[PDB]
């Protein structure tokens, strides 16, 4: 489950899918847009970050922080003790936000929804295991 081989695969495909500059901004907005279309109750959780207008800077800044947190978590996939400490940090931040396992289940299905549409090659099996790695560390 998300072994040394699969981490390389996932880190690679996340790179070209995430992109650079504003391609990260449209990517990040597509992720939460698909998150809401998969779970409508999730949209209210982001009332503090300008979810009224998903193109607003307030909400785009939140999306880039979440995808950027994903970006740094993907980077340290091959450093087990480093991502464990970072997942432990993120877990304490989400602990008071009244989230359940389906919220992280809707997020992953949004990740599986958006990421491959910017790719020619995608391995959902490796992405499923490696996401469960991150989600279980953040969910608790």
């Amino acid at each position: 489950v998300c072994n040394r081989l699969e981490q390389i695969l996932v880190k690679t495909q996340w790179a070209q899918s995430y992109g650079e500059a504003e391609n990260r901004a449209a990517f990040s907005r597509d992720l939460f847009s698909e998150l809401f279309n998969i779970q409508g109750s999730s949209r209210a959780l982001f009332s503090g970050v300008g979810v009224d207008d998903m193109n607003s800077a307030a909400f785009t800044a939140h999306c880039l922080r979440v995808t950027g947190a994903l970006n740094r978590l993907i980077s340290q996939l091959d450093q087990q003790a480093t991502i464990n400490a970072d997942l432990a940090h993120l877990a304490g931040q989400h602990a008071s936000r009244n989230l359940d396992a389906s919220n992280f289940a809707a997020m992953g299905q949004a990740v599986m929804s958006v990421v491959p549409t910017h790719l020619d090659c995608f391995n959902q099996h490796a992405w499923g295991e490696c996401y469960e790695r991150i989600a279980s560390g953040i969910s608790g």
Partner: protein, 147 residues
Amino acid sequence: SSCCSSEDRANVMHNWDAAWSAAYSDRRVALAQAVFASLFSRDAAAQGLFSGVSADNPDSADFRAHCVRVVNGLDVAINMLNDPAVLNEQLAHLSAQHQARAGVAAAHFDVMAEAFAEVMPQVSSCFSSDSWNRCFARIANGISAGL
């Protein structure tokens, strides 16, 4: 308060017609029934306003035709977004029809929005729910204005 922009309505119109086109079958009834199923589930009082169209039996042809008749009215207004001079006439037309229906308040169109906000992400492929909210308001405000 939110502006249905030129980019907004162009996005909604294409996504909407892609699912609601007459070239397809079985789609319109399943979508329009789910919209009203969500509507009555968010305000059980609203169902009583449709006793004339057999609301107590949704699978009746009398009620399914009401759902198609109502949602295809939205399709008419959606495809008018590229002609707001015509859209304003159509919205005033729908407004006076709803003003003459006892028990139809403006807060109902707030609940009707939630119904479409729930159904459309399940059925529309490239659904941008952010553009949908602003342009649905542009239309729903035109009808609800008065009641």
